[PDB]
Amino acid sequence: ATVLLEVPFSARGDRIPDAVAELRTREPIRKVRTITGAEAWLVSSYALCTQVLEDRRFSMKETAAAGAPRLNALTVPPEVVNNMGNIADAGLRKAVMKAITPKAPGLEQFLRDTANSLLDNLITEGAPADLRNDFADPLATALHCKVLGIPQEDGPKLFRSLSIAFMSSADPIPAAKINWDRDIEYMAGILENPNITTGLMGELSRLRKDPAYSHVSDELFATIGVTFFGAGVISTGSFLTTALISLIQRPQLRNLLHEKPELIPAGVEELLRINLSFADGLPRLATADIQVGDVLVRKGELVLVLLEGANFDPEHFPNPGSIELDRPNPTSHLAFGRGQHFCPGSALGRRHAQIGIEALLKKMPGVDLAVPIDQLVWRTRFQRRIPERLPVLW
Numbered sequence: 001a002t003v004l005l006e007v008p009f010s011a012r013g014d015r016i017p018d019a020v021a022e023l024r025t026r027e028p029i030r031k032v033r034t035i036t037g038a039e040a041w042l043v044s045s046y047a048l049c050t051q052v053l054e055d056r057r058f059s060m061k062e063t064a065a066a067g068a069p070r071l072n073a074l075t076v077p078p079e080v081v082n083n084m085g086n087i088a089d090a091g092l093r094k095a096v097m098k099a100i101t102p103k104a105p106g107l108e109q110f111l112r113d114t115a116n117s118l119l120d121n122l123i124t125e126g127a128p129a130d131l132r133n134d135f136a137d138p139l140a141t142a143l144h145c146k147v148l149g150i151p152q153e154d155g156p157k158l159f160r161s162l163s164i165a166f167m168s169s170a171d172p173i174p175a176a177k178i179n180w181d182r183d184i185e186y187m188a189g190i191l192e193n194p195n196i197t198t199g200l201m202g203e204l205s206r207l208r209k210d211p212a213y214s215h216v217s218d219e220l221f222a223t224i225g226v227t228f229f230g231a232g233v234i235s236t237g238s239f240l241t242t243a244l245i246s247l248i249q250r251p252q253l254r255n256l257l258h259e260k261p262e263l264i265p266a267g268v269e270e271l272l273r274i275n276l277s278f279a280d281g282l283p284r285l286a287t288a289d290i291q292v293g294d295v296l297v298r299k300g301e302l303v304l305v306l307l308e309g310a311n312f313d314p315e316h317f318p319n320p321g322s323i324e325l326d327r328p329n330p331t332s333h334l335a336f337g338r339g340q341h342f343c344p345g346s347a348l349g350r351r352h353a354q355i356g357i358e359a360l361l362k363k364m365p366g367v368d369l370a371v372p373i374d375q376l377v378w379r380t381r382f383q384r385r386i387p388e389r390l391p392v393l394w
């Protein structure tokens with residue numbers, strides 16, 4: 001006898017398990033057990049993944065309900081699971097989204113300057129260099145301090161909350177609450193700090209004193225800062241880190257992008273499509289009985305949308321494991337989600353990765369792993385797949 005199939009399948013972000021294609025072919029919606037012991041429906045085809053993400057009756061907010069089957073334990077207050085809904089209800093969606101585009105004057109130049117400086121320091125120190133801890137993550141952290149309008153020197157401590165905040169744990173995490181409360185206090189102080197006049201926090205600080213927003217809670221204003229820093233930094237840093245592995249392991253593509261950097265956006269779009277950064281399916285709770293393929297999902301059941309199930313589906317992306325810069329549907333992947341909860345930072349995430357890769361290929365055209373790929377240490381029980389260190393030479 002065997003137990004019910006358990007998720008996640010593997011924390012390795014450098015290869016997709018053969019099991020994904022087998023599940024997609026035979027049972028594209030199938031029952032699994034999560035790390036909490038709850039049962040859930042794992043959805044692994046493009047068609048069914050899009051169906052779930054485009055049907056709001058599969059609710060993100062309701063995953064936080066007491067007594068629901070859980071993918072993992074909450075690391076934020078339950079109301080924060082509805083973060084974007086709360087922002088929209090407060091009338092703040094347009095302002096938040098405008099503050100996090102890559103189009104602000106000097107922002108892309110700041111990204112280039114920061115990437116080039118980080119790479120120069122690695123070259124000066126000499127190989128081996130750690131492209132996660134000393135390139136991709138500091139670049140993400142610096143970018144988000146700039147976007148938020150907060151001091152660069154405050155970034156590292158905020159960043160160090162993230163190895164706990166984005167855990168995917170069976171049980172509540174005491175350190176997550178300690179860091180959350182402290183980071184909220186920091187952002188509340190930022191709102192009261194007269195020097196904070198630019199970026200997202202500068203804009204929220206002004207809106208907070210605008211009579212049209214007098215009803216919006218100070219709790220929400222501080223939460224926007226903590227959540228956008230955390231989600232943005234963990235997502236951009238982890239994506240860039242694993243995209244760099246994908247690129248390093250494809251010297252032909254690395255050389256092509258080095259020779260023709262105008263192909264970098266199309267390359268990054270494929271790197272997004274094949275990216276394994278999300279360690280768990282996206283969770284949703286059914287609020288009605290809904291037919292998904294061969295399964296009638298019942299009200300109150302947990303559904304997990306496996307992004308790499310959709311993104312490696314050969315019925316949507318022929319030869320799905322291959323990076324093709326001339327696909328007819330290149331942005332139709334689900335790396336940024338789909339539907340109501342589509343990532344509001346997608347343009348900034350694209351630009352972070354494009355500029356980081358452009359700078360790396362210019363400064364380190366001979367970049368290669370400095371250890372055998374199997375020697376990378378993949379973080380476990382985390383909401384992202386990332387190597388703890390990414391040792392390279394050039």
Ligand code: HEM
Nearest residue numbers: 084231232235236239282335336337340341343344345349
């Ligand atoms: C390459 C980088 C990124 C990737 C791959 C990514 C991925 C995703 C995905 C898949 C979702 C959908 C989650 C779901 O439906 O359950 C999402 C939502 C979200 N992302 Fe991103 N993200 C990235 C960058 C960013 C950045 C830079 C920010 C902010 C500065 C950000 C903030 C958010 C927020 C707040 C949500 C929730 C939106 C909602 O619930 O409506 N992300 N992201």
Ligand SMILES: COc1ccc(C[C@@H]2NC(=O)[C@H](Cc3ccc(O)cc3)NC2=O)cc1
Nearest residue numbers: 076080081082083084165226227230231235
């Ligand atoms: C791209 O990753 C996500 C992850 C989760 C959600 C759902 C919902 N929306 C959010 O805005 C924050 C994100 C967050 C921030 C900080 C933190 O310590 C933990 C999580 N929490 C949520 O639960 C959305 C996107």
